[PDB]
Amino acid sequence: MRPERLTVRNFLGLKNVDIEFQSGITVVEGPNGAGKSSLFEAISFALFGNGIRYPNSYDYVNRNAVDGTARLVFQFERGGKRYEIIREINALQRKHNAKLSEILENGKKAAIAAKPTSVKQEVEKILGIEHRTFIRTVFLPQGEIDKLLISPPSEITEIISDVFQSKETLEKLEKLLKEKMKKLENEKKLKEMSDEYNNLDLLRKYLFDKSNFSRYFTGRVLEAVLKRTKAYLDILTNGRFDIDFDDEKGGFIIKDWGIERPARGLSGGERALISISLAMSLAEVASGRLDAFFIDEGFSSLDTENKEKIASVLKELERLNKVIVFITHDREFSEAFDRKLRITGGVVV
Amino acid sequence: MRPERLTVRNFLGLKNVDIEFQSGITVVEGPNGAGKSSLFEAISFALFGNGIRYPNSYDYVNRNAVDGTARLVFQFERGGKRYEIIREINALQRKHNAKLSEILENGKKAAIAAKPTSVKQEVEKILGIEHRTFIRTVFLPQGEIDKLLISPPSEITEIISDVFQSKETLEKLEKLLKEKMKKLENEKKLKEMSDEYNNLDLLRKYLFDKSNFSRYFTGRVLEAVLKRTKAYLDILTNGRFDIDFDDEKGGFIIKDWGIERPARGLSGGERALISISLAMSLAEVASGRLDAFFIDEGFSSLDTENKEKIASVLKELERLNKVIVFITHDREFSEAFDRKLRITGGVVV
Amino acid sequence: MKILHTSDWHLGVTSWTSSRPVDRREELKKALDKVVEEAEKREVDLILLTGDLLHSRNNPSVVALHDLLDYLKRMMRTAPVVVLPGNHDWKGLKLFGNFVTSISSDITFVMSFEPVDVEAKRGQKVRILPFPYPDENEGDFRFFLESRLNKLYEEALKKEDFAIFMGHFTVEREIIINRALIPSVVDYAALGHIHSFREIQKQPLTIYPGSLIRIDFGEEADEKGAVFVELKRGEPPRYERIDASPLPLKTLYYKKIDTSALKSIRDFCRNFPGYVRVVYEEDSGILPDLMGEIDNLVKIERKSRREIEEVLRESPEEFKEELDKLDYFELFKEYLKKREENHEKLLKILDELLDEVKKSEA
Amino acid sequence: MKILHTSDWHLGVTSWTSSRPVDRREELKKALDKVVEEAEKREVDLILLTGDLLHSRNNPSVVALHDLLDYLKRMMRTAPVVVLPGNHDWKGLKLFGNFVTSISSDITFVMSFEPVDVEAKRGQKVRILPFPYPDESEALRKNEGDFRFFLESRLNKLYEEALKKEDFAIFMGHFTVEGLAGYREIIINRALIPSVVDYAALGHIHSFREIQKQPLTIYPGSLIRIDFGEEADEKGAVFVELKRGEPPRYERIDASPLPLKTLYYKKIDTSALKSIRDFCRNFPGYVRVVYEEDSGILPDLMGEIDNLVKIERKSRREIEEVLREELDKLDYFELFKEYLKKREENHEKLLKILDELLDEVKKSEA
């Protein structure tokens, strides 16, 4: 979606921040351990209700404020009609409130959900993105992005696996199906049992085998992700880079001017642009078009001189018009982005 | 002829002059009334013994010297063999001497005549030029030359008449012939008388009729003088001026570059060159080729500025190689001729 | 009758003299060769020449003239050629051409707005309607041009078999001409003076054949070659395009020349048969002598971010548009249903297993 | 067969550019016209062009080229023309001519020492023995030995190829025959020219000159008087006629181009001025006045007299160089005797009586 506004108070890592997302690419930075990582957590908790750091909702209250509630509002366009959501949560009171009021053209908010459980259902119903997927989509951790790029084919099919579906759910379906077969094998009626066993066991085998469904599913990403990755590498690179995928080779084989080339050979800013592009392509082929992205700096030890160069080459992302915000930790990356946002000591300076 | 030397002493207008003629034009000038006009008279006298100014030989003695003789020698080439003549004449003594001694290759003079009457006969026998013609030939008076040029046809035929023959002789032949006829008319024998009358009277008429012979003679002047005049106007004018004569129009037709033009239109130096050329042509058609000429300045009142210009244009006459001497009276004409000869007070300075 | 038409040639044209001079003559001959060879193999009846046949219109090199006359002969060997030289071309080429016209039937230089009646290889009576650059004040010029068209029209109607219009101008100093102004009664309108091929209209069939070699990078995306038109009485005009095969061009665009950029340029130029031009925006050195090293790197420029985006054009297909997002199981639901005779049943037991796991989770 | 031979034209030649520029083109066309017209009326079989057809060999004007090709066509309309261009190398003109040669029978540019076999209007088989200026560079070292030996070698070659003729064999050459007034040039001995040729058409010399009668060698010369150095020349082409049974015969066709006249003066003065004015006013051609002694200051005759192209100053020595007797004396009495001898039946009868009268006047005087 397009995050327009996000007023956070006493949310973990934050005390009182007021952010207004604007067209282009913003970059938030502050003293390590506060504001930067925590700010996004807040946005992902305003939608459904479950962040990504803690399981229990109440744990998301700032340590600096005890017995105090944490309020956070959030406006966001999605489908041509902007919505607004404000949840509050107090550890002491043991009570959590919320409300998904949509903002009308008239300027008056309309009710859609009262309980936090209702706001979750409604939000997930908007653009068919469950919290599980949302966490693995709009938030792109630089470390995992760059890794996906120069990843092997086996580790790649894995990445694609645990982004469209929970590994746990698959294992549970596994065990349940195996249990049903054990039940059948142990036990007119006998013919119906043999029909059920064979049919349930066959489906099992179809879903279970990596060679078939698992193989096809991976294709969608290569046939869909690449399809879209190419377009990104064109609008950002002026038709210079064009990548594809191949098992025979390492995996994501990348071509520069029709000529393939090792991804390690590329400069940092190229690894970044190309990697981020593929990443948004995967994120979007899984969750539809996205109008925003959160990327945090990875600060690989040998990546410092590049930090200033990478900043210049990534600036091309602004051409996509998406709301792209960087969650950098180092000042050198933070500097070369006209639009800056520093968060010191929980507050914004 | 080619006068080489002329030593005059006590000859009228002169006291003691020694002249040595040289190739090209020669100009002699001095105080008016002496040397200039008289010098030439002397040269005419040395040959024949008559001169021009006076009839009686003795009158040619200088006034400044009385009871004294006048001696004059004269060398002159004529026919490839140079001659020398020295006459002396004393008024008091009443005796005149002469001698025509020819100069040999050896350097020794040979006798040809002793008496002045003998030297005259011998000289006239050389180149068949009688004193009568010589006076009207080698001596060209500028006044008469220029006049002959722009002369009418009647006055022209006259000029040609009294240059090839004495008018007096013609008149005398006239009267004698008329007397014979009167004799016959007044008086076998009668038949012989009638035959003589008719025949003598017819010849008479042939001579007399200006209509017939006198006319043909005039033709001789046209056919031959022009013939030679053209050549002179070519060697001196570089083929610029051509002269022909037509009786009806009046004067001598003059053409400049094939285009006729009034002679009055020409500059002084052109009138001079053209006129002198025609003059030498007449003089030579009457007396054969001449290797010398005497011309004296006419000093027409309006001719002064021209005097200096005419001098420059007449200098072309030097190209003929003839011994041409000018007897100028004014200094301006005298100056622009490299070769000068001044005669002051009878002597040469 | 069959007609092979070739646009401007630009013989003896030296490309990129400001950066790295390249003698196109070799390439230009090879393309002409291929074109002429196609004309012979196709046994055309008439050959048309228009536009700038010589590159230099004020001082053609001797060799350039040699080549022109050379190919004029090769051309005539196959079929009668008609040349319409534009006024831009040098004058001794007009007096010359006129002289040859008179001593031959296999060639004809049209150089006046007055029509000429040529005769094709197979004897077809073609009438040429010429409209060259008016040789030897703007409102009267347009009036003058419009009048000539009225003239060409009247003279076009009086045709015998075919009537081909030939023109040297720029379809709407240059001469602008409205398409409507061109005679409609002509069987074909051969134009020239434009490097890039452009089929103006189909009635009457108006074509710019364009050059046979990419003269500059402003036309790296062009197909180069002649056009083989075919006029028949009973049926409408039809025309193919003959590909020249001339060396290709490629522009490499960079944000800034750096160690990576350099390697990219080197790697590309090394495997590229044509000529390369690198363009960049951000200041980048201090650049090494690429031309000195890379012998086929003809030009290095610096387009502004505004200009590099304008010239690039738009390629928005399959972008910024909605993408069919598919979930893992609904794709499973789909893969199974397509790949088995009876799916509905497996589909039903699946949703039941899903319901069972969902419930046993909350 | 009948042949019209023409010598260098100098098309688009501007005369006297240093004093008063005159565009000869008009006049030059009129002469060419008269020449071509005579060629047609005479129904010639072959037309030969040699020498300098274009005035400027490094940069011919467009018009000059236009005129040349114009008359080349008019020429071909009457009979096949063969052009031998000499020492001329502009804009690959030689290249032009070569191209047309190949596409036509009515014209043939010979531009190599190698013989070519043309064919006349009436079908006569003419073999051209060419000898142009030489292409490429011989070099300084080869000219003294290479240059004469090379020329000799060419002639030996043309000879051998001349013997192998069919009907007629015409030699064509662009050079200066040794023994002329001299006006780098190529000197060639007359003996060196092939004797077996039926005619040797030369060029490159403004003034007409019949070198020899065997083989008939001719310089036609220009059609207009290009400068005053040729005011005494007749200008025009030459119409030669070769037959098998009989020896060559040739007329001269008078072009009749404007005439020139040099007026020579000793000094320009009031009379001179009137003379110049009077002459130029009645002279259809161009005039040059030359003088020696200075008459300056001089009036602007050129500004007044529009046909006074040049005013020069030749030394008395030079004016005489460029410009390239006893007289009988007769006495009056002799002329008289002569007259009485032709204008009457019997002369002597009158002379006897006349001598008696002369004797009587002589005696009665001394």
UniProtKB/Swiss-Prot annotation, chains A, B:
Q: What is the effect of changing K175E?
A: Decreased DNA-binding
Which Cys pairs does UniProt list as disulfide-bonded? none
Q: Which residues bind ATP?
A: N32, G33, A34, G35, K36, S37, S38, R53, Y54, D59, V61, R63
Ligand binding (Mg(2+)): S37, Q142, D296
**InterPro entries, from UniProt?**
Helix_hairpin_bin_sf, P-loop_NTPase, Rad50/SbcC_AAA, Zn_hook_RAD50
Q: Give the superkingdom in one word.
A: Bacteria
Pfam families to which the protein is assigned, alphabetical: AAA_23, SbcC_Walker_B
Subunit note: Homodimer. Forms a complex with Mre11.
Per the record, the domain comment is: The two conserved Cys that bind zinc constitute the zinc-hook, which separates the large intramolecular coiled coil regions. The 2 Cys residues coordinate one molecule of zinc with the help of the 2 Cys residues of the zinc-hook of another Rad50 molecule, thereby forming a V-shaped homodimer.
* Family stated for the protein in its record: Belongs to the SMC family. RAD50 subfamily.
What job does this protein perform?
Involved in DNA double-strand break repair (DSBR). The Rad50/Mre11 complex possesses single-strand endonuclease activity and ATP-dependent double-strand-specific 3'-5' exonuclease activity. Rad50 provides an ATP-dependent control of Mre11 by positioning DNA ends into the Mre11 active site: ATP-binding induces a large structural change from an open form with accessible Mre11 nuclease sites into a closed form.
Q: State what protein this is by name.
A: DNA double-strand break repair Rad50 ATPase
From Swiss-Prot, chain D:
The protein's Enzyme Commission number:
3.1.-.-
Q: How is its activity regulated?
A: Nuclease activity is regulated by Rad50. The mirin-derivative PFM39, specifically inhibits the 3'-5' exonuclease activity. The N-alkylated mirin-derivatives PFM03 and PFM01 specifically inhibit the endonuclease activity.
Q: Which UniProt keywords apply?
A: DNA recombination, DNA replication, Endonuclease, Exonuclease, Hydrolase, Metal-binding, Nuclease
Q: Does the keyword Hydrolase apply?
A: yes
Q: Name one GO molecular function term.
A: DNA exonuclease activity
Instruction: Name the active site residues.
Output: H88
GO BP annotations of the record are: DNA recombination; DNA repair; DNA replication; double-strand break repair
**Which CDD domains does its entry note?**
MPP_Mre11_N
Q: What broad class of enzyme is this?
A: hydrolase
Q: Which SUPFAM superfamilies would you find in this protein's record?
A: Metallo-dependent phosphatases
Tell me which residues bind Mn(2+) 2.
D8, D52, H174, H204
What cofactors does this protein use?
A: Mn(2+)
**According to the lineage, what is the superkingdom?**
Bacteria
**Which residues bind Mn(2+) 1 per the record?**
D8, H10, D52, H206
The protein's job, in short, is:
Part of the Rad50/Mre11 complex, which is involved in the early steps of DNA double-strand break (DSB) repair. The complex may facilitate opening of the processed DNA ends to aid in the recruitment of HerA and NurA. Mre11 binds to DSB ends and has both double-stranded 3'-5' exonuclease activity and single-stranded endonuclease activity.
Task: Quote the subunit structure annotation.
Answer: Homodimer. Forms a heterotetramer composed of two Mre11 subunits and two Rad50 subunits. Homodimerization facilitates DNA binding.
Q: Which family does it belong to?
A: Belongs to the MRE11/RAD32 family.
Q: Sorted alphabetically, which PANTHER family does this protein's record hold?
A: COMPONENT OF ATP-DEPENDENT DSDNA EXONUCLEASE, NUCLEASE SBCCD SUBUNIT D
What's the protein here called? Answer: DNA double-strand break repair protein Mre11
The protein's organism comes out as Thermotoga maritima (strain ATCC 43589 / DSM 3109 / JCM 10099 / NBRC 100826 / MSB8)
